[PDB]
């Protein structure tokens, strides 16, 4: 888990940090639906796993930025845990 549990730690952070900067960046932009922590966390899980249904997504510049930060740190968190959870 020096690689496995290691990624999880980083990930569950971004998730939380993401959901937060998400509602933070999103409120204010009329129409944004990414404006409440609870779901904002569901969005992040979607995003980080790349499933993205579209039920919720970012609509502001920095919003999109966090988003990009979540996707990236997630598409790899899951990556390292991949050559592990299966190795």
């Amino acid at each position, epitope marked *: 888990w020096r690689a496995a549990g290691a990624a999880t730690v980083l990930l569950v952070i971004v998730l939380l940090a993401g959901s*937060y900067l998400a*509602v*933070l960046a*999103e*409120r*204010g*932009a*009329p*129409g*944004a*639906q990414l*404006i*409440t*922590y*609870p779901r904002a966390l569901w969005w992040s899980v979607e995003t980080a796993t790349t499933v993205g249904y579209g039920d919720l997504y970012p609509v502001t510049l920095w919003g999109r930025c966090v988003a990009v930060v979540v996707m990236v740190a997630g598409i790899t968190s899951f990556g390292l845990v991949t050559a592990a959870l299966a190795t």
Partner: antibody, heavy 118, light 108 residues
Framework: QVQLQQPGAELVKPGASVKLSCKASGYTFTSDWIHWVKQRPGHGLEWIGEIIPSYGRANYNEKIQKKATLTADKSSSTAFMQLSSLTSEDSAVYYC???????????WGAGTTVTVSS | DILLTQSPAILSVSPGERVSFSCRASQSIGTDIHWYQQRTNGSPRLLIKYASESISGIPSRFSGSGSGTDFTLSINSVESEDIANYYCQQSNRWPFTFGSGTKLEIKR
């Protein structure tokens, strides 16, 4: 105990400004947002704006002329709403309310009656 | 921004009768609707959250239903203490908005 404490009233001469306060107690989280709502006599509730104390950012209702400026003091757990250049149209009860970042106003202050008159 | 329509503005009911307040959203907002009660000279008080979730401290008499664009706040067997103005509020999209309110009137 009273979660949100607001002063009972404020008299303001036309053209002057006033700073309303809202002292909060009880549990406080980094995800709390403090909202302000305006209600004229005999009328409904109008959302003015919100602020997140943990970060200090504020958002405002775009549909109405901006009369307010929101700030918050973390050490005293107090949120403030500066209303400037008021007219009789600004006379109303101004409530502060707390939202735990989940969409609903869990609790409201008793409200501050602001009267704009000479 | 989401417009919340509350009609009729006044609802007259007889004591002990069931009453239903209406709230229609200009677009679909899932179940992101909350109801507040405001008595004369009082501050608003949360009654129901997310369309149908109970709030501790509120009489079982109060219940909510609906999803999408149409919502209802119901009171089983109205009594004097229920006389007040009732408002709906949405949190699906920014900015949060309030309905214009419905007053409950009792014909005794």
């Amino acid at each position: 105990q009273v979660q949100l404490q607001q002063p009972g009233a404020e008299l303001v001469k036309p053209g002057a400004s006033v700073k309303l306060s809202c002292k909060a107690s009880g549990y406080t989280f980094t995800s709390d947002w403090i909202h302000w709502v305006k209600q004229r006599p005999g009328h409904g509730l109008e959302w003015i704006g919100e602020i997140i104390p943990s970060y200090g950012r504020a958002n405002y209702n775009e549909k109405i002329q901006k009369k307010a400026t929101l700030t918050a003091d973390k050490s005293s757990s107090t949120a403030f709403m500066q209303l400037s250049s008021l007219t009789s149209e600004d006379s109303a009860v101004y409530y502060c309310a707390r939202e735990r970042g989940d969409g609903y106003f869990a609790v409201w202050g008793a409200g501050t009656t602001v009267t704009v008159s000479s | 921004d989401i417009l919340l329509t509350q009609s009729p503005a006044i609802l007259s009911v007889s004591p002990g009768e069931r009453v239903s307040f209406s709230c229609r959203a200009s677009q679909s907002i899932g179940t992101d609707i909350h109801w507040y009660q405001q008595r004369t000279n009082g501050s608003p008080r949360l009654l129901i959250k997310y369309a149908s979730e109970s709030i501790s401290g509120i009489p079982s008499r109060f219940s909510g239903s609906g999803s999408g664009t149409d919502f209802t706040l119901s009171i089983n067997s109205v009594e004097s203490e229920d006389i007040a103005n009732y408002y709906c509020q949405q949190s699906n999209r920014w900015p949060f908005t309030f309905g214009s309110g419905t007053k409950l009137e009792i014909k005794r």
